[PDB]
């Protein structure tokens, strides 16, 4: 229950152990969801990273967010890929919400306030609500398994979560700081724990 | 009789099913036409599309507006083609108006508000006036005949006709969001029956 | 002596008959000239084109504006050429005004209202008073022997000709749209004869 | 105690001997910094250089900022290295901001008013209180010891230190000239000694 | 004593004859100076024109501004050379503002109103005071080139002279059209002398 406003976490070096573990009071499993969040880092031109690692007991990559070196943002839910292909990449904080439906499979992805196609995934699927949700490491068991070659080095913030689609118009406010109330995950009232090399200073994107 | 306004119609997936059929309450035979509308994809890069099918019984490609791959715009009105050559190709919503005037064959296609040459193309023809309109597959039978290797996979929306030419200044309003009241088909009023995998969201483009 | 304010010629296709023919009142010849107008076509990427053609029986090419593919503008007054380098060619409405004076040979050549360097060409000549003043094809006697492999295939309009050097703020409001007075050739009491494929339709630049 | 505002140091040609000597009223010894300048070389393209240089008895390179050919800014705290990759070297003044905090051994680095990700780098060390501050020279040893090959070739000038971290708001009035005041060095209060080949002139940049 | 006021001298072709003489009466020899003008030429082939030639009896280039396309600007004073080249190829008109001080070597060059670094040049040096100013043409006094000087084509005027460095601020308002009054050669009482093909018209740039 931190007020995390004007903050970033930030993993200064490449590690196997830095994480910060997000804690969501959900109940109901999810039909579909948005998650929004900002993070800068300079990884992109060299190696892959995760950026969201939303992992159950049954299935470790429930909901991932993560860059693959080359190509663009990976998005994949339920254990099932889908790729939004970036070939000019550049270094500057990026803003970036997606959200999937399960009634019709559809996905947006929208970077910097602009959206991407909209493509189809995992339709009828449900994800599971008893979930470890970390931001830095990758999972690859719940709550662990971290593989290093994948970890995030750099800042991470502004991280909230519905558990329902948000509209362009709401997408949009959200971008441009408009004011909004999450309810899965509120950065506004965070409730996490913090593991490793991980420090908490002011953010550099405005 | 529906409202569409704000939305947009979505194929998520390349089939050979997925169509939307638009119902012109249309009686006397096309001398001219204009049809505007928005559209976004991602194929682009990769194969040719069907973007607007007017098909007849006598002609399957009445009046078509087609991406041919490597090449750009592909503007087919009676059976006789006609293209608007566009090298570097961005990915992000478009949209498009297009005319045609029997009486001397002049066409012009309008992309962002930007318009193209006027070019000649079916001098002295008449269109016909009982015809199938179909958004995202390639008619090649009145109503049918679907080649999904001209499927449109991403949105359209904001499809609008009128039985005359559009000045340069209403093409602009159009454009820039001005009123206007379309006589053949209307957003506002359109009259659709959708097929397959298609589902109405909220337009992504301003 | 006909208000073709707003208005522009437009021919559609590539031909060998399609011409208008402008009837300028001159008795004086020339010692001097300004020659201003808007054109807008998408030959420049393959073949040349006569923009405007001056001639009299004694010289077919008196005065001529035409574009060289692969070099840029092409000024020539009384048989004799010039050069006008455009190496990046674009595709868009293009405004052009261009001056001689027979007292220093100095022409110069505004392209959108900015200008070339001022070169030297013909000076002490004199440009004969009765003229055939051609637009769309390129003039090889008075009146006639139009190559095809020259014609223009596009829209022009608002061409007007002073028998005076316009100053830099003359030729600047001029292309600004402000209020002036040509003395041999005027838009808005131009005297013409159409000849063959050319229509008059709104003009698309604004 | 000279009110160096709107001014800056200029060394004209490439020496040996050219520097200007900063003194800080230093007592109690450093466990974080912030220094922000403004420097204008040509240097960039040819050769490394120092740019500012904080040396000790028992550390000639306590902190150091120095533009290393071919790679980018080299930022040095303790003796040891960190480096922030450019890329496209551009010619125009430049303005940098740079701070180190003991507590973390978070470093940024701003260049512009643009934060560049935010590095690790000596963690719990502290920098010695009794320095020498040089201008234009690369020092190797506590006031001394200048190679040639290091040295400044432009101008340098708003140069100001902090004791502790400011903060990106901070940072960016800085950049944006907005009214603050420094804690060790001040710009508007330096007290300098200039040697060699070095003058005092109107700053280029606004 | 004439108002050169938005005039330009105009050199329409390549000669060995044209030229413009410029009388400045100097009684003091010069000990700094500022020399602005604006200039337009179309950057041809490797051979470069001279931009302002003040020459004395003992030095034939005792302040020289020459540019070539493939060079840049060469800036020379007592027959001493320093090169400021400048990267982007702007073609239109040109503005540059030049100034050394003998006090230190140090020379500025503006152009467009932006500075390029400071460097040094003739450190203690004196300008003669009795010397041939030339506009158009390099000039080499007592005859002995083997062949001609090949002289500047294009427009050059709004010329300007001071005994003294002009400040940033100054060099700013010259720059954006502010009020001024030189004291060596003064555009709007200028004393000169025309020589060969060599026009006076008014100027292009604004
Ligand atoms: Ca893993
Ligand atoms: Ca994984
Ligand atoms: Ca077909
Ligand atoms: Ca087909
Ligand atoms: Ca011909
Ligand atoms: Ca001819
Ligand atoms: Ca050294
Ligand atoms: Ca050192």
Redesign the interface.
Known sequence: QTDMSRKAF?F??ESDTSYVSLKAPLTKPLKAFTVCLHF???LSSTRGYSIFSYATKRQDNEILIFWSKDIGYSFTVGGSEILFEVPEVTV?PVHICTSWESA???V?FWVDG??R????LKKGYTVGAEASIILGQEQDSFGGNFEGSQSL???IGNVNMWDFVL???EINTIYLGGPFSPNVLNWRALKYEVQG?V?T????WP
């Open positions: 930030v200064p070096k800068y880092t300079e500057a019709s499979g559809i947006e602009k959206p196609v909209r493509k189809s080095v750099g800042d509209s362009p118009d090399e420090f200073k002011p953010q550099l």
